[PDB]
Structures are given as structure tokens and as C-alpha cells.
Design a protein around this ligand. Structure first.
Ligand SMILES: [Ca+2]
Length: 279
């Protein structure tokens, strides 16, 4: 399949080179996989989701995304126009309030929720979780992300936006999950992206067009936007049978575009997520 005039980040994850605008992907498109978006919620009724999105848990008075961030992330995972895995099922877990913040105890509860709830969903090709959130180091938050990964979910987490070593942030610093940094359309590390030896991979994170609340769309930037590209890529690859939840981060790193990013500090991977699709 070929989607012309796609958002630059979609075009990038199916290209060996920057500067193209068509997204190429296998038509299976993540069908039979599931991605949990653990964030501010998802505006499920948005047509871009085509009935494939549903809120499954909230820790607040409503399950509505009153912020937009979670809807944007879900759109990069799996919206029809803006998504990597255009046929995946999307499950929203609202651990962040409408101001975009959440207590660590609530975030931990939401991770444990996903580890159990996947047994209530039909995801024959595999389960992914996209965590576009984080704060300072917490061994409890890292442990919860480790449990989620151990349960058989591919966990993708944002490196953080501090232009610093991700070792000091959670869940970014948990070794066993897939920690995602952000790049721009000219293959530079995004100025704000954290770095360090705990990073596994980079994805597109600067000026990312996706869905927003009120049935709308907008471009925004962050490692929060890079993470859902990797989560959607994992879902896509698991539907194709190329990898499993336990192996997907390593598979993505093995098949990544290698050595092509600029402003990568010494000791940080120079790997950019790539779907290796050959039509
Ligand atoms: Ca890792």
C-alpha cells in the first residue's frame, strides 16, 4: 500500500532516506493486534478511528479526553490518515487528567490494569502499550513498566523532553521496555529529546500531524509523538508475524536505519525506526 502526501513521520518510517512524502506499508496494517494508549484518554468517536478505538479505563471522573494529547498519540498509532497501523484496535487508559498530569500511583495502576485487561481483549497478533508520559526516576514506576513488559505486552515509552540523560526519568529508564527518542524531518535529534545508553530507538517527534479532540487535527512535538510511531510499528510487525511482544524492540532496533541521525551524543544509539517494507 501507498499513502501519498502522508505526514512526514509516516513517510520517514518506511524510507531509507529523509525528504519523501509517501507512506508505504503492507495492507494488513496491524489487523488483529491491539495497542493500549496510556495517556489523557482517546476521543473514540472521532471518524479517523473508524470505530476501532474505545476507552477501557479511567481514574478520573470521566473517560473523555479533555486535553487532546492522548487522542493525538492514538492517532499516530492507528488513525486512518495519521496512523502507522491503520487497522489496529486502540484501547484508551486515562491515567492523566485533562491538564496532562497524573500521580505516579495512578500511572502504576494503569500499567497493571493493561497487564490484566489484555486477557479480556481479542489481540491474536499481539499487544502493545504506548506510554507518552513520564517524570523523575521512580523505581516503583520502572517496576510497573517492567511487569507490563514481562506480561507479554510490547511497552514503548517516551525518553522525555529534557535534553538530558534519560537515566533520570521514569519509565524511560526501565531497561526492559523500549525507550524512544525523537527526531526531526531533517534527521536531527530533536532539540528537546533526551538521550543516553538507555534509549533503544528514535522515531519522528518534531511537528507531527495527528488527530485532536473535537474531531480536529493539529501538529505538535515531543518524545510523546515519537513513542506512538514505534508502538504502531510494533503492532504492524506483529501482525506480519515478524516479531512478538517480547522481541519487538530488539527486532525494530535490528532493522532500523543505522547511523543516519545528527546531534546524537556519544554513547546514544543512532537508530531510526524503519518498517523495511518492500512492495
Ligand atoms: Ca530497553
Amino acid at each position: 500500500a501507498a499513502q501519498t502526501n502522508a505526514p512526514w513521520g509516516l513517510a520517514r518510517i518506511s524510507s531509507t532516506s529523509p525528504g519523501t512524502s509517501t507512506y508505504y506499508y503492507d495492507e494488513s496494517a496491524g489487523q488483529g493486534s491491539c495497542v493500549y494508549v496510556i495517556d489523557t484518554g482517546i476521543e473514540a468517536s472521532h471518524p479517523e478511528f473508524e470505530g476501532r478505538a474505545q476507552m477501557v479505563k479511567t481514574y478520573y471522573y470521566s473517560s473523555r479526553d479533555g486535553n487532546g494529547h492522548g487522542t493525538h498519540c492514538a492517532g499516530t498509532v492507528g488513525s486512518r490518515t495519521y496512523g502507522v497501523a491503520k487497522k489496529t484496535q486502540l484501547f484508551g487508559v486515562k491515567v492523566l487528567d485533562d491538564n496532562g498530569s497524573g500521580q505516579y500511583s495512578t500511572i502504576i495502576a494503569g500499567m497493571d490494569f493493561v497487564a490484566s485487561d489484555k486477557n479480556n481483549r481479542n489481540c491474536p497478533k499481539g499487544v502493545v502499550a504506548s506510554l507518552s508520559l513520564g517524570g523523575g526516576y521512580s523505581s516503583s514506576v520502572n517496576s510497573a513498566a517492567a511487569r507490563l513488559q514481562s506480561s507479554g505486552v510490547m511497552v514503548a515509552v517516551a525518553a522525555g523532553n529534557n535534553n538530558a540523560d534519560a537515566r533520570n526519568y521514569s519509565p524511560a529508564s526501565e531497561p526492559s521496555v523500549c525507550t524512544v527518542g525523537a527526531s526531526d524531518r531533517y534527521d536531527r535529534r530533536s532539540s528537546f529529546s533526551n538521550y543516553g545508553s538507555v534509549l533503544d530507538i528514535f522515531g519522528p517527534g518534531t511537528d507531527i500531524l495527528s488527530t485532536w479532540i473535537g474531531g480536529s487535527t493539529r501538529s505538535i512535538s515531543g518524545t510523546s509523538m515519537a513513542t506512538p510511531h514505534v508502538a504502531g510499528l510494533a503492532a504492524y510487525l506483529m501482525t506480519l508475524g515478524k516479531t512478538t511482544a517480547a522481541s519487538a524492540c530488539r527486532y525494530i532496533a535490528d532493522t532500523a536505519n543505522k547511523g543516519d541521525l545528527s546531534n546524537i551524543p556519544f554513547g546514544t544509539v543512532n537508530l531510526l525506526a524503519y518498517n523495511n517494507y518492500q512492495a
